[PDB]
Amino acid sequence: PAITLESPDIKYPLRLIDREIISHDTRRFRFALPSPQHILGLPVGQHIYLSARIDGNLVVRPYTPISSDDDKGFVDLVIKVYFKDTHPKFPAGGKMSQYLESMQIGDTIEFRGPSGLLVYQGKGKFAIRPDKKSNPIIRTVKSVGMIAGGTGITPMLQVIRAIMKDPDDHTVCHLLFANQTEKDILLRPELEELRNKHSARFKLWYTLDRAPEAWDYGQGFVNEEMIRDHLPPPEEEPLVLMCGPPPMIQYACLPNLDHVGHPTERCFVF
Ligand SMILES: Cc1cc2nc3c(=O)[nH]c(=O)nc-3n(C[C@H](O)[C@H](O)[C@H](O)COP(=O)(O)OP(=O)(O)OC[C@H]3O[C@@H](n4cnc5c(N)ncnc54)[C@H](O)[C@@H]3O)c2cc1C
Fold this sequence. Notes:
The structure is a monomer. By secondary structure, the chain is an alpha/beta fold. It folds into two domains: 1-115, no CATH class; 116-269, no CATH class. The chain contains five helices and 17 strands. The chain has helices at 96-102, 153-165, 188-197, 224-229, 246-260; strands at residues 2-3, 12-20, 26-32, 38-39, 47-54, 57-63, 74-80, 108-115, 118-122, 125-128, 137-140, 143-149, 172-179, 202-208, 218-219, 239-243, 267-269. Bound molecules: flavin-adenine dinucleotide. Flavin-adenine dinucleotide (FAD) is lined by residues 47, 59, 61-64, 77-80, 82-83, 86-87, 90, 93-97, 151, 154-155, 243, 270. Residues 47, 59, 61-64, 77-80, 82-83, 86-87, 90, 93-97, 151, 154-155, 243, 270 line the site of flavin-adenine dinucleotide.
């Protein structure tokens, strides 16, 4: 159809048309593409760049839509709002996130894309560029390991959806979704729906820093056992995809990946 993100260098103002309070911090923000038949123009695996001049300082932060290029007229972004005066070190909270919460209906925010090193080309085929200028290295995988932390499910979900939507895409997605509390399990219905509908291909497990009284899943930070039991066996040569808070990736993921047997080259951070 009509691509909204025609140029990666042009910022495209889109209007906010709906907001869904996914959780206390994270909200699903729907934006209106230029035409009701216009598409976003986002290859699976890539992300967009929201740009706005907040506090006199142009702040450009990146977000991965939960919408699919199949969806027309709208762009759904599950964005967590780091609230002000809710963190001891950060009384100013998030910058773009708080602007987005403040955004009323019909306010405009600029979009830029596509941007990203990973593109899913279908049926195991992941085009991962080592650098933005270097050419993408293409590797077909039978399983995809995925470690998502909080708002880092949106890049995973994009991939999960694409694979499950193609019945000839036999790649098997293993997801490890790490959040602080049960209330913080974003897109949990969608995810559980995906698993029920495509169990053979989608394997789902959660970990919560502070779990509820009844947690049939896992507790604590990301650990080696959960990477071992709830991600693909390293022998299957899978692709471990990771999005989470930089600390979580550095201290909980990358270390415990080595322990299980996953190589750095078979692993990618969104
Ligand atoms: C590929 C990709 C996709 C992404 N997709 C999404 C997405 O879909 N949705 C999304 O929300 N984010 C997404 N992010 C992350 C996003 O860019 C930000 O991390 C954040 O959501 C908004 O930025 P900000 O300007 O609000 O943060 P900043 O203001 O730049 O954050 C500054 C620091 O303050 C901390 N901080 C501030 N207040 C608090 C608080 N109350 N509690 C804890 N820490 C606090 C932050 O954690 C951070 O360390 C994505 C990132 C990447 C790389």
